[PDB]
Design a binder for this molecule. Structure first.
Ligand SMILES: N[C@@H](Cc1conc1O)C(=O)O
Ligand SMILES: N[C@@H](Cc1conc1O)C(=O)O
Ligand SMILES: [Zn+2]
Ligand SMILES: [Zn+2]
Lengths: 258, 258
């Protein structure tokens, strides 16, 4: 009955506490999703164990093997009971796992090194000098790959053929590339992460333009799991009681450094 | 077999076309939810009949009889098969009906007549010359009635006992009250309607401040319904293809008059 929670090391959702090495179990981690996991568990009445997804991914179906990787795979193949992370609710995922109503709203956004002469996706598409990419698996890449909006189709056409690769394995990798490229690389990531980074030292990046789309993160469970109903209701209750807005402010803005 | 769709006359979601008297059935109406209903039915493969909710309400439970009114009641008591409307996903409603994932995100906002000395809820709570209320039943009124947050708790106390009533029966009545009250009345309504009206003639109102919460509208079905699954998947598909964004620009800003 101890619920195995799969999640991912992604700031400020789940981060290692500075002393984690002298701590045990759930106490080793801190962050928005660590706080949310505690509350979901308390309102649903279950004991849980946080575990970091082994391959460090969000989740995508390999087109050859057709095997799901990341947190989605952990749920699909029975290695975890629930996923509490910045996991995007999408059609292909909803087809294999269950999602609660969203606990956070977001949209794909553009992250630039300050001073970059870019102001929108249209600007990125109309030039070639500043390279741009996305996480190499997950909802953002899939959004561009399936987009039929020309500004986005043009962007995908370029990204899928750019060399060296413009895709990165982790959010941190994308942010570092932005920071170390003197303005020649812009990163396409979720508004939530983009807004977070813009508030952290060295305060050299910023989110530009509006969001490209609109969607949410949901707490996921294995298709038909017994936890789904209570978890969904708990998210709604916690949102209505102001918990979610409080956690957003606590982890994004209250200890912002810029 | 023809699906009975319950919806509500609320601009620009569902409105009577100018020439509706000489039109019939579903053709009499136009709007975002009318376009959405057509997109959902096509993907889920069903024929439908649009019907305006009899009592003109969104849906709330009478504390004494425990009977649901509005579109929620029409689903609860079997008078309709699905509600395609700007119906807000809430915990009390989710307990009695099913909601698809969000097709639109929004938040409670403040509508003022241009030039009114108000910039936030807080601003409304610390004065008494400017009355302010909400729709008479629905998710907004509940929000203030259930607030564990100080500014808002203060707002319910004044609202619940103001006399005469600061509550209104329809969004239109709330908007008209703002407009003819020479700035002595502000109306609390969802950002979607607020932003919409703000872009319509006589262009004398405006949304002030930020949203008070974050939530969404969902397509609702009776508990356990055969349509729940397909509808939910259709919403996600429509969002990802950009149809939902397309419809929003179509009905909100493409014809704006200010
Ligand atoms: N939440 C996303 C991952 C993600 C995080 O930030 N940009 C992204 O693409 C997912 O679920 O793939
Ligand atoms: N969407 C709300 C109603 C509503 C619309 O605009 N302000 C409101 O309160 C509901 O479903 O009750
Ligand atoms: Zn379609
Ligand atoms: Zn009564």
């Amino acid at each position: 009955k101890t619920v195995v929670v799969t999640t991912i090391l992604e700031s400020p959702y789940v981060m290692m506490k500075k002393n984690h090495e002298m701590l045990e179990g759930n106490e080793r981690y801190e962050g928005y999703c660590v706080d949310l996991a505690a509350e979901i568990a308390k309102h649903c009445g279950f004991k849980y164990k946080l575990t970091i997804v082994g391959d460090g991914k969000y989740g995508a179906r390999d087109a050859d093997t057709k095997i799901w990787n990341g947190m989605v795979g952990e749920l699909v193949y029975g290695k975890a009971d629930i996923a509490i992370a910045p996991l995007t609710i999408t059609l292909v995922r909803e087809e294999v796992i269950d999602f609660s109503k969203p606990f956070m709203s977001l949209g794909i956004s553009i992250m630039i090194k300050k001073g970059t002469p870019i102001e929108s996706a249209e600007d990125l598409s109309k030039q070639t000098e500043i390279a741009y990419g996305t996480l190499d698996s997950g909802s953002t890449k899939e959004f561009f790959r399936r987009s039929k909006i020309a500004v986005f189709d043009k962007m995908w056409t370029y990204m899928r053929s750019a060399e060296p690769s413009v895709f990165v394995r982790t959010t941190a990798e994308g942010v570092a590339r932005v920071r170390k490229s003197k303005g020649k690389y812009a990163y396409l990531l979720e508004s939530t992460m983009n807004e977070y980074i813009e508030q952290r030292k060295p305060c050299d990046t910023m989110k530009v333009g509006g969001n490209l789309d609109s969607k949410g993160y949901g707490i996921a469970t294995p298709k038909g799991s017994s936890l789904g109903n209570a978890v969904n209701l708990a998210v709604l209750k916690l949102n209505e009681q102001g918990l979610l807005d409080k956690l957003k402010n606590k982890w994004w803005y209250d200890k912002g450094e810029c």
